[PDB]
Amino acid sequence: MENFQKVEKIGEGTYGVVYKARNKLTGEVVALKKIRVPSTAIREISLLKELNHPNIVKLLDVIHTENKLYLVFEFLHQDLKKFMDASALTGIPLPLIKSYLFQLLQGLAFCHSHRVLHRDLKPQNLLINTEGAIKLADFGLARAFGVVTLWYRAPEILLGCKYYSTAVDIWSLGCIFAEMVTRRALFPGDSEIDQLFRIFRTLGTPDEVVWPGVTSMPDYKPSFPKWARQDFSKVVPPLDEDGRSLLSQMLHYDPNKRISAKAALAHPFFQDVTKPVPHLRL
Ligand SMILES: NS(=O)(=O)c1ccc(N/N=C2\C(=O)Nc3ccc(Br)cc32)cc1
DSSP states (O other): OTTEEEEEEEEEOSSEEEEEEEETTTOOEEEEEEEOOOHHHHHHHHHHTTOOOTTBOOEEEEEOOTTOEEEEEEOOSEEHHHHHHHTTTTOOOHHHHHHHHHHHHHHHHHHHHTTOOOSOOOGGGEEEOTTSOEEEOSTTHHHHHOOOOOTTOOHHHHTTOSSOOTHHHHHHHHHHHHHHHHSSOSOOOSSHHHHHHHHHHHHOOOOTTTSTTGGGSTTOOTTOOOOOOOOHHHHSTTOOHHHHHHHHHHTOSSTTTSOOHHHHTTSGGGTTOOOOOOOOOO
16 A cells, blocks of 8 residues: 555565555554555454464564455565575574574464464574564465465375364574474475375385375375485584474474474473574665
C-alpha cells in the first residue's frame, strides 16, 4: 500500500518478494512481504498474528486491500545464511552454534505445541540481530498458501507421505545444525531422487527394521540401491559426543522416533549453553 516506501528489495521468498519498508505514519522499519485471495488463507494468516514468541519473527499486520495481500513483519538485519558465509573461513564458535540451536528449538517447541509447522526451514529463513538472538521467519505460511532448495527436506516428504508432522522441522533443524558445525551442507541434492540418495548414502537405505511402514510409502521403490550407514564421527567432525548424539536423534528416519523440540531442549548438549554476542558487520 502507499503507506510504505519500499526502501530496498531484501529478497525473493517463496510466496513473493520481501522489501525493507518504512511505515509513513509510525516511521518504523519493517519487512514487507508482497504475496501475488482465498478465504481460508486469510483466516489462517490471521491466526499467525497471535503467535507471539521471542524466537519467532513477529507478523505485525496483514494488508488485504484491492484484492492484494501484503504481510508486514518485524525487521531483522541479517539471515543465518549470510552470517555463515561471513564465517566460512573461521567457522562459527561452538558456544554461538549451541546458543542459536537452543533458541531455535524453543521457537519450534512453541509452534509445535500450537500444532503449527514451518515445513520449510532453511538458513535463509533464520534471522539474527546484534544482540545474540535468532528468529524463525515464514512460520506457518506453507500451510496457509501451500530453484527451490530440497537440501533440508525430510525423507517422509520426499517419499510421498502427504500427512507429515512436526518431525519434519526437526529434520530440517538437524541438517542446519550439521551445516553450522562443518561449514558444508549435509545433503545438497539437486533433484528429489538425488536428495533421497544422498540421504541414503550417509544414513543407509531405510528398511522395515529401522522404519516400519517405509516400504508402503507412495514413492518408495523396491529397486532403491541399498547403501550401508556411515559412521557419524565421519559425517560431522569435530562435534563432541553429546552433539553427535543429539544430531543422530534429530536425523532418525522414522518420524515417530525422531526427537521432539521439547525433549531436545533437555539434552546434555545444552548443559553448558550460554548466550554470546556475535560480531555482526551490517
Ligand atoms: N542476506 S541478508 O542481507 O543478511 C538479509 C537481511 C535481512 C533479511 N530479513 N528479512 C526479513 C525480516 O526482517 N523479517 C522478515 C519476515 C518474513 C520473511 Br519471509 C523475511 C523477513 C533477509 C536477508
